[PDB]
């Protein structure tokens, strides 16, 4: 399968610089065109940059808003594409996807979140939410910055009946919640644990839900 | 820059209904470089149709694309539950490459009442001097819904944070989370905490409450 691993995201103060990397695998990297696309709630989907294959010029192309500040490059020997970003603005905040194009087919990575802000990184606090054929449990993930966090239940094996809600920002701090609904015979008989990862603070917290 | 306009931004549709989404360019776009992407929340956009009318791998046959010059369209013959998603048109005929605003496509289903669950503050959060009361309103349709918090009968609106999920792909319902945050002192000063949900499925609200005792 095609795989595009993105990295280099995180928090940066306005005016600072950051470099995004994308390591490719599963295809002939030298043949593909490599692009960077960005997505934000306010600006939608934005093509950011493109660099074509050696076969047709190796020519870079940029969006108007990033000209002179962003630099796209590629290393075929490492199957990697890079986006250097200088003098970053608040509008640069968003999810950056690395994409590859062969013929008319294209492939997107899972993306990495870039946040341009002067606020400080802070790890999340994970609070258990405990209380009839079904029973609902949850986790409150409060007071973290920046986005994102990932939430699973029992290391991803408990996927049915899960609702992870979008984060809400207030006072430069994010808060979200996650609920899971299970049969009443399974809890507290079987264990239910939420797993919360916050890569920006390099933190992961597991919380087993136990009755009150 | 070629600007693409996808109106309307939101669209509802019946199961089995023929749906059509439009994409209008400010200038001419070569059909070979007009494509459509599908996106579901929490996941990257996926190439859905390339070169105006060619279905990508994995896309069911009920999808089709059409158009030319300055007007393109995506058409679903029989709307199904798994088709509820956002759809973006994209052009790379003239650089810079540009996307449409996207169209949120939602499917209709039989009305369903929310499952409401209330949770008092955890002891861990109390040790830090805060108190959050959580209310989940899960798996309801339609998306229109109201929630309000009551402390000892008095309506509360400060310290409330709401969050909504997009339409579920399997049962086509919606969900909501409401969090009322207080200081530990404020929380200890009252007894009755109430979360009540008003939805199109009942004249009287669904009420869930608890007392600190």
Q: Tell me whether residues B136 and A179 touch, CB distance under 8 A.
A: yes
The two tokens of residue A66 are 């990033």
Rounded-to-integer distance, Cα B180 and Cα A166, Å: 16
In angstroms, the Cα distances linking A66 to A11, A33, A120, B90 are: 19, 19, 25, 19
Q: Tell me whether residues B124 and A127 touch, CB distance under 8 A.
A: yes
Q: Are B11 and B19 in contact (CB under 8 A)?
A: yes
Rounded-to-integer distance, Cα B46 and Cα A2, Å: 13
- The answer on A98 and A88 residing in a single domain is yes
Rounded-to-integer distance, Cα B213 and Cα B210, Å: 9
Nearest to A2 by CA among A24, A23, A22: A24
Q: Are A49 and A67 in contact (CB under 8 A)?
A: no
Rounded-to-integer distance, Cα A199 and Cα A123, Å: 9
- Kindly list the strands in the beta sheet with B174-183, ordered across the sheet, starting from the edge strand earlier in the chain: B115-119, B130-140, B174-183, B160-164
B88 touches chain A (CB under 8 A): yes
A62-90 in b/e form (b: 16+ CB < 10 A) is bbeebeeebebebebeebbbbbebeebee
The two tokens of residue A189 are 């008989």
- The answer on B73 and B27 residing in a single domain is yes
Residue at a domain's end among B62, B88, B107: B107
B7 touches chain A (CB under 8 A): no
Question: How far apart, in Å, do the first and last CA atoms of chain A sit?
Answer: 46
Residue at a domain's end among B107, B124, B139: B107
- The answer on B156 and B82 residing in a single domain is no
Q: Are A175 and B174 in contact (CB under 8 A)?
A: no
- The answer on A187 and A106 residing in a single domain is no
In angstroms, the Cα distances linking B110 to A201, B133, B172, B177, B200 are: 43, 31, 9, 22, 12
- The answer on B96 and B16 residing in a single domain is yes
- The answer on A123 and A112 residing in a single domain is no
Q: Report DSSP state, residue B178.
A: E
Could you tell me the CATH number of the domain that includes residue A142?
2.60.40.10
A23 lies in which domain range?
Answer: 1-118
Rounded-to-integer distance, Cα A188 and Cα B108, Å: 36
Q: Tell me whether residues B163 and A168 touch, CB distance under 8 A.
A: yes
Q: Are A139 and A166 in contact (CB under 8 A)?
A: no
Classify residue A93: in a domain, yes or no.
Answer: yes
Number of domains in chain A: 2
Residue at a domain's end among B85, B107, B129: B107
Give alpha helix (H) positions in chain A.
none
CA angle A159, A162, A209 (to 5 degrees): 95
B100 lies in which domain range?
Answer: 4-107
**CA distance, residue A76 to nearest chain B CA (Å):** 24
Q: Tell me whether residues B44 and A109 touch, CB distance under 8 A.
A: yes
Q: Label residue A42 left, alpha or beta by phi (over 0 means left) and psi (-120 to 50 means alpha).
A: alpha
**Among A136, A142, A176, whose Cβ lies nearest the Cβ of B163?**
A176
Provide the experimental method for this PDB entry.
Answer: X-ray
- The answer on B175 and B135 residing in a single domain is yes
Rounded-to-integer distance, Cα B36 and Cα B144, Å: 29
CA angle A63, A66, A72 (to 5 degrees): 80
What is the resolution in angstroms? Answer: 2.6
The two tokens of residue B21 are 């989404």
- The answer on A102 and A125 residing in a single domain is no
What are the beta bridge partners of residue A35?
A50, A99
- The answer on A126 and A79 residing in a single domain is no
- The answer on B186 and B121 residing in a single domain is yes
The two tokens of residue B13 are 């549709």
Q: Label residue A60 left, alpha or beta by phi (over 0 means left) and psi (-120 to 50 means alpha).
A: beta
In angstroms, the Cα distances linking B98 to B1, B26, B33, B69 are: 8, 11, 11, 15
Number of domains in chain B: 2
Q: Are B73 and B82 in contact (CB under 8 A)?
A: no
> In a 10 Å sphere around its CB, with 0-12 CB exposed, 13-18 middle and 19+ buried, how is residue A202 labelled?
exposed
The two tokens of residue A57 are 């010029």
Could you tell me the CATH number of the domain that includes residue B66?
2.60.40.10
Instruction: Find the helix or strand (DSSP H, E) in which A60 lies.
Output: strand A60-62
CA angle B67, B68, B69 (to 5 degrees): 145
Rounded-to-integer distance, Cα B127 and Cα B122, Å: 9
Q: Are B114 and B145 in contact (CB under 8 A)?
A: yes
Rounded-to-integer distance, Cα B125 and Cα B133, Å: 11
- The answer on A44 and A144 residing in a single domain is no
Rounded-to-integer distance, Cα B209 and Cα B192, Å: 7
């Amino acid at each position: 399968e095609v795989k595009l691993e993105e990295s280099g995201g995180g928090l940066v103060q306005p005016g600072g610089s950051m470099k995004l990397s994308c390591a490719a695998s599963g295809f002939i990297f030298s043949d593909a065109w490599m692009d960077w696309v960005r997505q934000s709630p306010e600006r939608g989907l934005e093509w950011v940059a493109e660099i074509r294959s050696k076969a047709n010029g190796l020519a870079p192309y940029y969006a108007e808003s990033v000209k002179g500040r962003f630099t796209i490059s590629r290393d075929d020997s490492k199957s990697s594409v890079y986006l250097q970003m200088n003098n970053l603005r608040s509008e640069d905040t968003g999810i950056y996807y690395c994409t590859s194009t062969l013929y008319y087919f294209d492939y997107w990575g899972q993306g990495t979140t870039l946040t341009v802000s002067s606020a400080k990184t802070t790890p999340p606090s994970v609070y258990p939410l405990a209380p009839n054929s079904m029973v609902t449990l949850g986790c409150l993930v409060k007071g973290y910055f920046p986005e994102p966090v990932t939430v699973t239940w029992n290391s991803g094996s408990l996927s049915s009946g899960v609702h992870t809600f979008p984060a809400v920002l207030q006072s430069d701090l994010y808060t979200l919640s996650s609920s899971v609904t299970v049969p009443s015979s399974t809890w507290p008989s079987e264990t239910v644990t939420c797993n919360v990862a916050h890569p920006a603070s390099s933190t992961k917290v597991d919380k087993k839900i136990v009755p009150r | 820059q070629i600007v693409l306009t996808q109106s309307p931004a939101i669209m509802s549709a019946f199961p089995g209904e023929r749906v059509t989404l439009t994409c209008s360019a400010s200038s001419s776009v070569r059909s070979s470089y007009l494509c459509w992407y599908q996106q579901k929340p929490g996941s990257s956009p996926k190439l859905w149709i390339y070169s105006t009318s060619n279905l990508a791998s994995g896309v069911p046959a009920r999808f089709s694309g059409s158009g030319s010059g300055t007007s393109y369209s995506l058409t679903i013959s029989s709307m199904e539950a798994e088709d509820a998603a956002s759809y973006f048109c994209h052009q790379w005929s003239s650089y810079p490459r540009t996307f449409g605003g996207g169209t949120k496509l939602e499917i209709k289903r039989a009305d369903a009442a929310p499952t409401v669950s209330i949770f008092p503050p955890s002891s861990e959060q109390l040790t830090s001097g805060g108190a959050s009361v959580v209310c989940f309103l899960n798996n309801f349709y339609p998306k229109d819904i109201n929630v309000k918090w009551k402390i000892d009968g008095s309506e509360r609106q400060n310290g409330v944070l709401n969050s909504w999920t997009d339409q579920d792909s399997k049962d086509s319902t919606y969900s909501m989370s409401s969090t009322l945050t207080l200081t530990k002192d404020e929380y200890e000063r009252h007894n009755s905490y109430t979360c009540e949900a008003t939805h199109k499925t009942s004249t009287s609200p669904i009420v869930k409450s608890f007392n600190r005792n």
